[PDB]
Design a protein around this ligand. Structure first.
Ligand code: HEM
Ligand code: HEM
Ligand code: NAG
Ligand code: NAG
Ligand code: NAG
Ligand code: NAG
Ligand code: NAG
Ligand code: CA
Ligand code: CA
Lengths: 146, 443, 10, 244, 141, 145
């Protein structure tokens, strides 16, 4: 969707400081922990039952990394959203048939992990902007379902 | 099941809070989804006139005990209220503040008036319904409801919902709530779903209308409509203004309100002749930006008798007497102007299409189609006026265009201005053609 | 008929 | 359904999505070539108990397959509607049977015992409490009837019954109902999932029977057992009705 | 489904919130009007501006309701019954909105109380607000 | 074919099958009309070693959501017909970026245009580094599609 310059500016400036080797994996393993039925898709990793196993298992953060990157690529060019996730959308929707609502849940746990790290400096307007972002992402990723 | 309907605490036996007797015990009905068809069925069952049926509890207390019917939905042809759709009897979430009530009326006992705005056409909207006084709440109060009120009272249009301080009449416990009308209704009572009393109005009371007929200026006795003695209608009476009580700012307001442009002159001493009747003993203390004199503060005249020999006059900036002559239609012809009391032909020496456009717009003839050269409509038998007009073509009236007539060259008797307009008022200038460059001189 | 979806769930 | 198992193939061709007058999406299942089961409850949304079939029938909108709009002639309510929660919808014409659209068989045998597992489809809400954009489905085990009784109310013996229901409203629990347990991953079935059939696939004779229809769809996250009214118990009633 | 573990966790975490429960309740509300303007259509006459006293007090109310619920949590729906009927029927609030406010309340509480939000708690907190928002919604029809 | 996922590996394999040089392969439509009728392939994703376009992964034939504005196209070149210049900034080192590809003139859109792309352009033309992307008014040469 269209976005006014100071949201995108606060977004990118904030996104610079985001640690790219941890945050994504923490959002992913947190989605796994809070809504354990997604473990169904990832259980090739190992024991996902307790939160400590999840937090330790190197393949959880290994996957999260690729997902966090893919989202960085989304946030980079937000005007052409359809094309960037078109292939990921084929992977998830046609072969896996992940229900697209857990995408937004993940985007929310992401913003949550963001807020967890960034405390008071992650403000309601900047959050509302990232919500807009993870929305546009969830939509573009879900576009081939209709 | 033993069913009976009665009204309690009504103004009449066919108005009041609606009570149903069921199996020997009495209880009330909730207002949820309760509409005019349900009220109409009740009114019909009581045998009262159903031409106007109000919802709400007028002077009716809150009920007690059971609320027997909820979400009543009638089609209006049904013979009794308890055969319509409703939730299960006695199963509700309502409280006795939401008890339904009715007023069945022929329309003759409802009066509406504005009080306290200095005239019958401005003030707080007070209503008297079944001899109960109340006020309209400003929640949901817009220009549509105000315009309906102004029209029903013959006060013209609503201009503004404002403050005008006053010694107002106090107080009430009864409030009118309007959920919304479309605005094309003939009466406020024709607005749908208005609520009379029974809901806990907040701290934003006292909505107040100023209609366009609160104070109406006019100019009388001048040679042009934008020049003359000032007379103002306040209420239903015209009165003169004293030359002491009408400032330059007030004259500016007058020329703007009358759509006469800028103030050209103020003239004391009955310059346009003495008025007749009442002279207003009030000074208009306008700041000069107000859209209407109704918004200006008024001060009482300090002790002094004014006479009509001191009536204030204003002259505003416009020449209005232009006509088309010898057209086959009123929208084509030779242009004649009145100057010095005489009609005369305008010279075509500077008569362009922009000037003709301005005349065609002023004459409600749409766009100018051509300026035929020569006395195609005849030369006329009068003097030829050698006024050179300079319209841009965007002016609404010829009197807004700059005019130069001093030293203008002699116009040959056959070189008279003429115009052909589109003749259709629906044709307006659209932006493109205007050549991509304008030149102006400033200061 | 019973038991013959063109593509069952499995 | 809040959790997963997206419906990729359309393995449940008898599922119809009926939307009430105020845009409330609800399940109904196609029980034969001219008829579909549903619940009395589902039928009664946005209508008074006073309302009769003639009133209710024109209000509903019904959808089969993808968008496929089948029209609807009359409506009939179970005589015990307030106890046995079941309607029947008769479709104005026949529906073309094919891979995605086809009625389900009513079971002769009774698979109500604990240890069996079943498959419930649904159009209901998800964990954002949004009406789902695409039909989904979930597998559920069947639950011990006594554990479920003691769960939703307090009693067994009817004088000790009290409203212990985690949600506001009490479900209907009698001898014509059975309870299905919670999921393996704690998935369950929410608003909109009523009227969908609890369909058990019989592997030896390879057929999918509708053993029950979902009555209480309020349980969602909070209430450990969903509860269905056995279809077998209305067996001899539905046949009588089909003749008219 | 709120196991003993969850319940304990939710109590221990919501205690450490204490008297600040009110202002968070209000901060959360602010976010929804800023984040999801459609929820504003339920609060026409409210002053929606920043830190509005009206907002602050309504937030103190919702906060105190929640504290009541968690004080005796093993039967919440009896305690919250009158709010069940208040939001369900009178206000007719569309059930997505409770999940909205639930999530705004979790982000806000997260932001202000970093040390206690280990995943187990984020879990049982989301369950707790689920169970409640259901019980308020569960009398819908 | 729809442009969804259409990349340089797809263009390189297609031109290779046609036998043209594959050293530089651009996407997009130069002078090409809008297509009509069927869009046969969507979300083509090749590894680049495949001998034909129809052995890569794709959705079902004829099932797409694309319209004919998103039809994929290619231009394969050996690099000898690609020119880059700045015009209209008063010197060869400032101005609008004009490109000439297959004798078609065009311009770079500023969407995604940053200092990194500009310094690369400045270095390739041997103009040193990009300092800043600004206005300098001028009599510029117009226009392109
Ligand atoms: C909405 C934001 C999402 C993004 C940006 C994303 C991104 C990715 C990426 C980058 C990969 C790796 C692809 C590769 O190796 O080249 C992947 C794989 C995968 N995605 Fe996601 N994903 C998202 C949501 C989800 C969710 C929520 C799920 C399931 C709950 C999911 C299911 C999967 C699975 C199962 C894989 C592994 C596929 C395999 O290796 O066989 N996707 N995703
Ligand atoms: C966790 C779920 C919720 C809780 C615990 C809650 C709590 C409350 C409380 C304590 C009140 C005041 C009751 C009274 O004054 O008698 C209230 C009223 C109200 N609630 Fe909520 N609420 C919830 C969900 C929602 C949502 C999601 C919305 C809309 C987005 C909403 C809209 C309202 C409105 C409009 C009022 C009336 C305010 C007034 O007029 O004073 N509620 N709620
Ligand atoms: C309103 O009702 C009261 C008694 O409830 C009565 O005394 C009073 O006269 C009524 N008002 C009018 C205007 O008749
Ligand atoms: C649904 O029920 C309410 C409550 O009685 C009623 O007012 C309304 O007309 C019904 N229909 C819709 C579409 O809301
Ligand atoms: C809800 O129902 C109304 C009234 O029939 C209709 O105008 C509206 O489009 C419906 N909304 C949806 C989302 O179906
Ligand atoms: C409804 O229940 C009553 C009470 O037991 C019973 O007499 C009646 O037969 C039931 N209806 C049917 C259709 O069996
Ligand atoms: C592009 O424009 C026209 C239309 O297709 C074509 O004839 C022409 O040859 C092309 N341009 C050049 C520079 O060859
Ligand atoms: Ca009604
Ligand atoms: Ca590709």
């Amino acid at each position: 969707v269209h976005l006014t310059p100071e949201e995108k500016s606060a977004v990118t400036a904030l996104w610079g400081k985001v640690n790219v080797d941890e945050v994504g994996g923490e959002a992913l393993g947190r989605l796994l922990v809070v809504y354990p039925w997604t473990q169904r898709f990832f259980e090739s990793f190992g024991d996902l039952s307790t939160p400590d196993a999840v937090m330790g298992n190197p393949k959880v953060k290994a996957h999260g990394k690729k997902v966090l990157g893919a989202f960085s690529d989304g946030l980079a060019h937000l005007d052409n959203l359809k094309g960037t996730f078109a292939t990921l959308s084929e992977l998830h929707c046609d072969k896996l048939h992940v229900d697209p609502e857990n995408f937004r849940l993940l985007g929310n746990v992401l913003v949550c992990v963001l807020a967890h790290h960034f405390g008071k400096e992650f403000t309601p307007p900047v959050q509302a902007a990232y919500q807009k972002v993870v929305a546009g992402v969830a939509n573009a990723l879900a576009h081939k379902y209709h | 099941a033993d069913l009976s309907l009665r009204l309690v605490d009504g103004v009449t036996e066919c108005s009041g809070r609606l009570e149903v007797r069921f199996q020997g015990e009495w209880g009330t009905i909730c207002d949820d989804g309760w509409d005019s068809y349900d009220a109409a069925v009740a009114c019909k069952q009581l045998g009262c006139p159903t031409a106007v049926t109000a919802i709400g509890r007028v002077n009716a207390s809150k009920g007690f005990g059971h609320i027997w019917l909820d979400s009543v939905s009638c089609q209006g042809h049904e013979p009794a209220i308890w055969q319509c759709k409703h939730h299960e009897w006695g199963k509700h979430y309502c409280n006795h503040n939401e008890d339904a009530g009715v007023t069945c009326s022929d329309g003759s006992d409802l009066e509406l008036r504005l009080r306290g705005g200095g005239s019958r056409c401005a003030g707080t909207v007070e209503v008297e319904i079944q001899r109960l006084l109340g006020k309209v709440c400003d929640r949901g109060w817009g220009l549509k409801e105000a315009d309906v009120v102004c029209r029903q009272l013959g006060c013209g249009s609503a201009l503004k919902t404002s403050y005008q301080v006053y010694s107002k009449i106090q107080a009430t416990n009864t409030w009118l709530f309007l959920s919304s009308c479309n605005g094309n209704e003939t009466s406020l009572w024709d607005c749908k779903n208005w609520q009379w009393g029974g809901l806990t109005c907040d701290h934003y009371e006292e909505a107040k209308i100023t209609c366009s007929a609160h104070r109406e200026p006019r100019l009388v006795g001048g040679d042009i409509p934008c020049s003359g003695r000032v007379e103002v209608k306040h209420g239903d009476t015209w009165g003169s203004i004293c030359d002491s009580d009408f400032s330059l700012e007030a004259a500016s307001v007058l020329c703007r309100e009358l759509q006469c442009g800028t103030v050209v002159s103020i003239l004391g001493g009955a310059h346009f002749g003495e008025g007749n009747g009442q002279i207003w003993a009030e000074e208009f203390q306008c700041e000069g930006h107000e859209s209407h004199l109704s918004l200006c503060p008024v001060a009482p005249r300090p002790e002094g008798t004014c006479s009509h020999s001191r009536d204030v006059g204003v002259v505003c900036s416009r020449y209005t007497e232009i006509r088309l002559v010898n057209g086959k239609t009123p929208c084509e012809g030779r242009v004649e102007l009145k100057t010095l009391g005489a009609w005369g032909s305008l010279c075509n020496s500077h008569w362009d299409i922009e000037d003709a456009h301005v005349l065609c717009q002023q004459l409600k003839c749409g766009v100018a189609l051509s300026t035929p050269g020569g006395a195609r409509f005849g030369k006329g038998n009068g003097q030829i006026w050698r006024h050179m007009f300079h319209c841009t073509g965007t002016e609404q009236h010829m009197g807004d265009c700059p005019v130069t007539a001093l030293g203008a060259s002699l116009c040959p008797s056959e070189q008279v201005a003429s115009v052909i307009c589109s003749g259709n008022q629906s044709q307006t200038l659209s932006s493109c053609c205007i050549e991509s460059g304008q030149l102006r001189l400033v200061n | 008929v019973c038991g013959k979806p063109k593509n069952p769930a499995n | 359904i809040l959790g997963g198992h997206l419906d990729a193939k359309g393995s449940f061709p008898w599922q119809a999505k009926m939307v009430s007058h105020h845009n409330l999406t609800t399940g109904a299942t196609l029980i034969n070539e001219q008829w579909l089961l549903t619940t009395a409850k589902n039928l009664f949304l946005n209508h008074s108990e006073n309302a009769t079939a003639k009133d209710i029938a024109p209000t509903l909108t019904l959808y089969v397959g993808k968008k496929q709009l089948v029209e609807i002639e009359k409506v009939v309510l179970h005589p015990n509607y307030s106890q046995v929660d079941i309607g029947l919808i008769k479709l104005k014409q026949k529906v073309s049977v094919n891979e995605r659209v086809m009625p389900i068989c009513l079971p002769s045998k009774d698979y109500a015992e604990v240890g069996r597992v079943g498959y419930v489809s649904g159009w209901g809400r998800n964990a954002n409490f949004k009406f789902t954009d695409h039909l989904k489905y979930v597998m559920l085990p069947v639950a011990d009837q006594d554990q479920c009784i003691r769960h939703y109310e307090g009693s067994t013996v009817p004088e000790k019954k009290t409203p212990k229901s985690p949600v506001g409203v009490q479900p209907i629990l009698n001898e014509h109902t059975f309870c299905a347990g919670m999921s393996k991953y704690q998935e369950d079935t929410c608003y909109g999932d009523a009227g969908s059939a609890f369909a058990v696939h019989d592997l030896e004779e390879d057929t999918w029977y509708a053993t029950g229809i979902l009555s209480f769809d309020k349980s969602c996250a909070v209430a450990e057992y969903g509860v269905y009214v056995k279809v077998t118990s209305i067996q001899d009633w539905v046949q009588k009705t089909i003749a008219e | 489904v709120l196991s003993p573990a969850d319940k304990t966790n939710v109590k221990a975490a919501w205690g450490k919130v204490g008297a600040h429960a009110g202002e968070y309740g209000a901060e959360a509300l602010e976010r929804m009007f800023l984040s999801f303007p459609t929820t504003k259509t339920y609060f026409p006459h409210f002053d929606l501006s920043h830190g509005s006293a009206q907002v602050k007090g309504h937030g103190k109310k919702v906060a105190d309701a929640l504290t009541n619920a968690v004080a005796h949590v093993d039967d919440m729906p009896n305690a919250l019954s009158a709010l069940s009927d208040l939001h369900a029927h009178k206000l007719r609030v569309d059930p997505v909105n409770f999940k909205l406010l639930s999530h705004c309340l979790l982000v806000t509480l997260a932001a202000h109380l970093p040390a206690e939000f280990t995943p187990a708690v984020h879990a049982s907190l989301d369950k707790f607000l689920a169970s409640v928002s259901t019980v308020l919604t569960s009398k819908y029809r």
